Amino acid sequence: PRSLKKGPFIDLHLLKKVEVAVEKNDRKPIKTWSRRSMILPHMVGLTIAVHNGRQHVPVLVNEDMVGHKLGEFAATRTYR
Amino acid sequence: TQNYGTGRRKTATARVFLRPGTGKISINNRGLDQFFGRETARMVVRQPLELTETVEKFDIFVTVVGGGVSGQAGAIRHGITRALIEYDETLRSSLRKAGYVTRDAREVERKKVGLRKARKRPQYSKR
Amino acid sequence: RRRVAAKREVLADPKYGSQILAKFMNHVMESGKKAVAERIVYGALDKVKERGKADPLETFEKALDAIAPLVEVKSRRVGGATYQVPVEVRPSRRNALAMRWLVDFARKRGEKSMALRLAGELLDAAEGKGAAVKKREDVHRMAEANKAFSHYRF
Amino acid sequence: KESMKNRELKRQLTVAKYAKKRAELKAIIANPNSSAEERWNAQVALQKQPRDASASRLRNRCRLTGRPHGFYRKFGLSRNKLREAAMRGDVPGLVKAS
Amino acid sequence: QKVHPNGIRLGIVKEHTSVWYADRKNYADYLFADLKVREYLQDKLKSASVSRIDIHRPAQTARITIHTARPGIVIGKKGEDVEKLRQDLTKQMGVPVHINIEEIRKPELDAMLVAQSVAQQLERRVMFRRAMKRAVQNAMRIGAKGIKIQVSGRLGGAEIARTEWYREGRVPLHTLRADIDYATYEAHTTYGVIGVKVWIFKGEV
Amino acid sequence: IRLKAFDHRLIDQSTQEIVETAKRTGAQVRGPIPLPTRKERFTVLISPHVNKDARDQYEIRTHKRVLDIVQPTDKTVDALMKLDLAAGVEVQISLG
RNA sequence: CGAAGAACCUUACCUGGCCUUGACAUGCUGAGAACUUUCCAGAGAUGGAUUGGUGCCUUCGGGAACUCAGACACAGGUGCUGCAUGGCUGUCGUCAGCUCGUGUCGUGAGAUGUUGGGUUAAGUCCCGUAACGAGCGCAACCCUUGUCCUUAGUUACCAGCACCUCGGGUGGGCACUCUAAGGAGACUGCCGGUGACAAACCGGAGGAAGGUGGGGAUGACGUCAAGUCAUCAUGGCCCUUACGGCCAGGGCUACACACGUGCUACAAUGGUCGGUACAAAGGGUUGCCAAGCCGCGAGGUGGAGCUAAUCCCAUAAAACCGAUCGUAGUCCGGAUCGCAGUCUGCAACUCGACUGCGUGAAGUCGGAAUCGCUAGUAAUCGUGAAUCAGAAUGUCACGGUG
Ligand SMILES: [Mg+2]
Ligand SMILES: [Mg+2]
Ligand SMILES: [Mg+2]
C-alpha cells in the first residue's frame, strides 16, 4: 500500500498545525478529523484527538506507532 | 490431375488436396503422427480411405484452420469424403451408408445466458 | 410421453479393433476426459495381457457375461401395496448394467495404480469371486424371493 | 433528486477546469528520474487544490434521467430509459435481434 | 407482456426515426442532442399536431423533416416560425440545422395524432367511451383495416383501474410482415393520469 | 483509391458513378475491388428487471471498396468528388 | 435481487460545522464585462487580500452575455399513499386456448358455434353437424446456423513464369482458396403400404438439409388490488429558518447465531518439473500501449505500429511426450496470520486488487431431505467484455474434449 515511489503521506493542515506546534511544546490536544495521514518521527509523543465518528478520542503517540496510521487507534463500531 | 475438397465440422474449416502418390499425408506442413498425437483421430481421418480401400493410391495434402483436435479430425474426414467423391463419382452409396458425406450440423448451442450452461438452471430452492 | 428417442451410435476403437470396448470406455470417462480414459482402459488391458497368455478381449467378454444379469426386480406400486416385480432384462440393457457395475466397484477397490483396480476386477470377473459377481448373485437371489409377483399383482 | 443533478455538474466543471496542472504534477511524480525534492513540493499542489477535480470524484450519470446505477458510456441513457428510447427507433442501428 | 410493436419490426417492416453514424466519441453526444430536440419540438408544437420527427445527418451539418397534418400553422406567412426555429435549434444543436415540412394527408391513420386527439378529448371531461367509439369509426371509414385503442387510468373512479378495450377490424401482432403504427400519449386530468395506446393497422407486406 | 461506407446500396452503386465518369475522359480505370467487411457484434441485456435469459445482439457493417487507375491524366474525378460523395461515403485517394 | 463496481465521490443514514428566494427556473430593483488573481485563516464549507482584463452590437442613448446583493410569488423534497393511477416487468405459461357479427333454442342467467370420429407440437387439419363467418392466439412472415450460382480480387491466394537470403519474401497473375452482397433450395415434393383411401401415419429414393432441418426473437382474453410514487410522470396530504441545501469524518463490508446462491477442495481417471498442438468471439487515434531493457515476481523505463484481414490486447487451457511423487491429513488442500512490495487514486486503518518469503488449519465424498439435465445435452478447461481511476468466485460472450 502506498508504494515507495511516492513514499510518505501527511495532510497539509495537520503538518502545518503539528510542525509549528512542536516549537511551542505539548500543552493541548490536536483536534483533527483526518484519519488518512500516517504519523512520523517528527510527531513522537504528541496528543492527537482523532475523530471517532461522533466525538474526538485522545491518542497517546509512542515511538512504536510510527508505521501505523492514526485511524487504527480510533474505533468505528462498538459491539459492547 | 489432383482433386479438391473442403471439410467443415465443429467450427473447423479444412482444405483437402487429393493427389496420386503413396499416402505421404501432410497436415500444416507436418506429419499425421506429429499432428494427432496418439488418439482416435489417426484412424478417423483414415477411415474413408480404408472403407473404399484406396489408402495407398492417393497422396493427401491438408491445410487446417479453426476448432480443436476432434473437430479438425472430423473436418479432415468430411473433406476427404467430398474430395474422394469428386474423383470417382460412383461410390456415393458406400459413403452414404457409412454416413461420412453427411456434414455434422451439431454446433455449440448458444448459451441461454443467465442459465449457467445452455440448459443448466439455478438450483431452485422452493422456500 | 410420446416415443421420440432415436438411436445415437458410437463405434470407434481403432488401436484394438473392437466395438464393445468403445462403449465400455464411454462409461469410464469422466468430464469428457476421453484421452485420459482411453489409456486407463488400455492400461488395464495390457496388464491383463501380461497376467494371462490369452488375448484380453476374450477375458473382457467372459467378464461381461459373468456380471450381466438375467432378471431384476421392478418396484411398481399397486396404489396401496409396495410390491416388486422380477422383470426379464432386455438383451440390449444387460451389457450396460455390467459395464456400469464393473467401474463402480473398481473405483472402490482401494489399491494404487488405478488401472490395476480395473485389471483386478476383470481378472476376478472371469472366475466368479468378484464383488460385481457377488452383487449379480445377490440380485438373482432377490429375484427368486420376488418370483411370487412375476405376473399377479404386477 | 434535482439538487443532486446540480451538485455533480459543478464536479464535472471543476474537473474540466484545471485539467492540466494535475496532469503535470502526476507526470512529475511518475518519472523515476525526478528528484524527491521536486516530488515532495508537488505533493503539496495536489493536496491544496479542492478534491473535486479528479476523475475519481466524477460519477457519470444518465444524462436525461440522472439515475447513477445502470449506465452505458456507448449511450447517454439509463438502463430503463435506453429501452424506451430504443423501441421507438430513436437510436440509430439498434433493433431487436437474436 | 406485449413487447413494443415497433422494436420487434425494425427492418423488413419499419425503419428507424433517425439515420446517422457516429464513432464511440460522439455517439452519446449526438443521441443527447437528438433526444432533447424532439422534447423541445413537441413542447413547442402542442398545436399543429406532430407525429414523426426524422433527423438525418448528411455530411457534417444536419437534416430534419418535421411531419405535421396542418403545415400552414407552422409555416405562417412564408416561414415566419420556420426561420425563427432554425435560428434557435442551432443553439441547442451547434451544427447548422435544416427544416423540412411534409403533409400527413389522411391524418386519422397515425397513432400519435389519434392519441393526442383522445388525450385532448379526455381532458375536456368527455365520456370515456363515446370519444373512442367515434374515434375508431372515423379512422375506419377511410384507410386502416383494423384499429385497437386501449384507455387505462382512473376513468373518473375513486379506486378503479379499469381498461377500455374497443376494437374493430383485423390487428395482428405476431405477424412481422405486417406494418403497424403505435403511439403512447398520456393525459393529465384534474385527478388521475390516463394512458392511451393505439394500434392502427395498415396494409400488410 | 479506397472507399468506406456502411451499406452496399450506396458504395457499390457509386462505383459505377466513378468508373463511367473516369473512363469517359480517356483515362483507363480497371474494375473495382471488394475487400472484407468489418462485422462488430454489440451484445447488451434487454430485461429491465433481472431475467437474464432474454438476449439481444446487434451487428454493424463497414463495406470497403478499392479502385485502380492505369494512366493518371484526368483531374475530373478530383473535381467531381462532392458529386461522388452523397451521404456517408468516405474516399481516401491512392492515385496509382 | 434494484447494485452493469460502497475508500471519499455514489449516499438517501449518523455525529458535527455552515446556509434561508437558497445549488437550480421565470419575473422585479441596483452594481460591475466575462475572466484571471497563482496569498492567508480554517477539517472543509466558507471568509478576507488578489498583480492584473475592461471586452462585445453600437439610433453612441445604450442594449445583450455573464457575476454579486435585496424582496415577493416561489424553487426543492430518495417525505406518505403501488389499494388512486400512467409506463415497464414477474406470474400461471409459449400452456392452447379466449372472444365477437347474424340466426336458433330457453321466460332467464346461458348454450349453440368452440360439441361427435380420426389426427396433430397446436381450436393444426379432414369427415359429419342450427349453425353460417370473422378476430386474438397457433403456423408462416423476422434473425442466426448448414449446400450451390452470379459479380469482383486488396491488407486476401500462389495454379503458370522469373527471382530469391528459399519467408508469396519480391515482381507478377486473376486459375482457385478465401471473403460478402444479390438469389435458388425443402413444399410429405415423389414411390410402396396403411386410413372412409381424408386428413394423416409407417418405410424408401434423391438431395447438403426429411418430415414445424437446429436455435433465437415473437408469450392471446385474464389472474395474483403481485412489485415499482426510489428510474421517470402524476391526483391528494405534509415539510418550506427545513422532512430543503453545502462541507468534513463515520456508516451501508459490524457479528454467539439460522437460511439461499456461488467457487475451492478432500486427491493417484491425480500433484509438480521440462518439452510441444489447435481455437472462436470481442476491444483499441482522449485509446491499444509492442521490441530492447532492468526486476525472484506483481512490474518500471521505452516509445514503435495503429485507426484496422495491416499493429497491439494475445502466451488459449484441457490433451499428447519424458521424469518423479506411491494414496501418507500427504510434493493434497489452501483458509488463517507475520514480514516485504508494486499498480490506481489528493487519499488503500476502519475499507481495495495483486506480487515475494514463512505458517500451515477444517476437510478422507458429506443425515432427513433436495435440485439441473434427453445431445455438441450434462460434465470439465480456457479465452475476451459490459459496469470501470482501481476492484469479480457473480454476471457479459464465444470456443476446446465430450
Ligand atoms: Mg406423459
Ligand atoms: Mg373453450
Ligand atoms: Mg474494471
UniProtKB/Swiss-Prot annotation, chain A:
GO terms for cellular component: cytoplasm; small ribosomal subunit. Gene3D superfamilies: 30s Ribosomal Protein S19, Chain A. InterPro entries: Ribosomal_uS19, Ribosomal_uS19_bac-type, Ribosomal_uS19_CS, Ribosomal_uS19_SF. GO terms for molecular function: rRNA binding; structural constituent of ribosome. Pfam families: Ribosomal_S19. One of its GO terms (biological process) is translation. Keywords: Ribonucleoprotein, Ribosomal protein, RNA-binding, rRNA-binding. Belongs to the universal ribosomal protein uS19 family. Protein S19 forms a complex with S13 that binds strongly to the 16S ribosomal RNA. This is Small ribosomal subunit protein uS19. It comes from Pseudomonas aeruginosa (strain ATCC 15692 / DSM 22644 / CIP 104116 / JCM 14847 / LMG 12228 / 1C / PRS 101 / PAO1). The gene is rpsS.
From Swiss-Prot, chain D:
The keyword Transmembrane does not apply. Keywords: Ribonucleoprotein, Ribosomal protein, RNA-binding, rRNA-binding. GO terms for biological process: translation. Gene3D superfamilies: 1.10.287.1480. Part of the 30S ribosomal subunit. Contacts proteins S3 and S10. The lineage of its organism: Bacteria, Pseudomonadati, Pseudomonadota, Gammaproteobacteria, Pseudomonadales. Belongs to the universal ribosomal protein uS14 family. This is Small ribosomal subunit protein uS14. Pfam families: Ribosomal_S14. GO terms for cellular component: cytoplasm; small ribosomal subunit.
UniProtKB/Swiss-Prot annotation, chain E:
InterPro entries: KH_dom (IPR004087), KH_dom-like_a/b (IPR015946), KH_dom_type_2 (IPR004044), KH_sf_prok-type (IPR009019), Ribosomal_S3_C_sf (IPR036419), Ribosomal_uS3_bac-typ (IPR005704), Ribosomal_uS3_C (IPR001351), Ribosomal_uS3_CS (IPR018280). CDD domains: KH-II_30S_S3 (cd02412). It holds the Pfam family Ribosomal_S3_C. Gene3D superfamilies: 3.30.300.20, Ribosomal protein S3, C-terminal domain. One of its GO terms (biological process) is translation. Residues 37-105 form the KH type-2 domain. One of its GO terms (cellular component) is cytosolic small ribosomal subunit. Keywords: Ribonucleoprotein, Ribosomal protein, RNA-binding, rRNA-binding. GO terms for molecular function: mRNA binding; rRNA binding; structural constituent of ribosome. Belongs to the universal ribosomal protein uS3 family. Part of the 30S ribosomal subunit. Forms a tight complex with proteins S10 and S14. Binds the lower part of the 30S subunit head. Binds mRNA in the 70S ribosome, positioning it for translation. This is Small ribosomal subunit protein uS3.
From Swiss-Prot, chain F:
Coiled coil: none annotated. GO terms for cellular component: small ribosomal subunit. Disulfide bonds: none annotated. GO terms for molecular function: structural constituent of ribosome; tRNA binding. Involved in the binding of tRNA to the ribosomes. Part of the 30S ribosomal subunit. This is Small ribosomal subunit protein uS10. The gene is rpsJ.
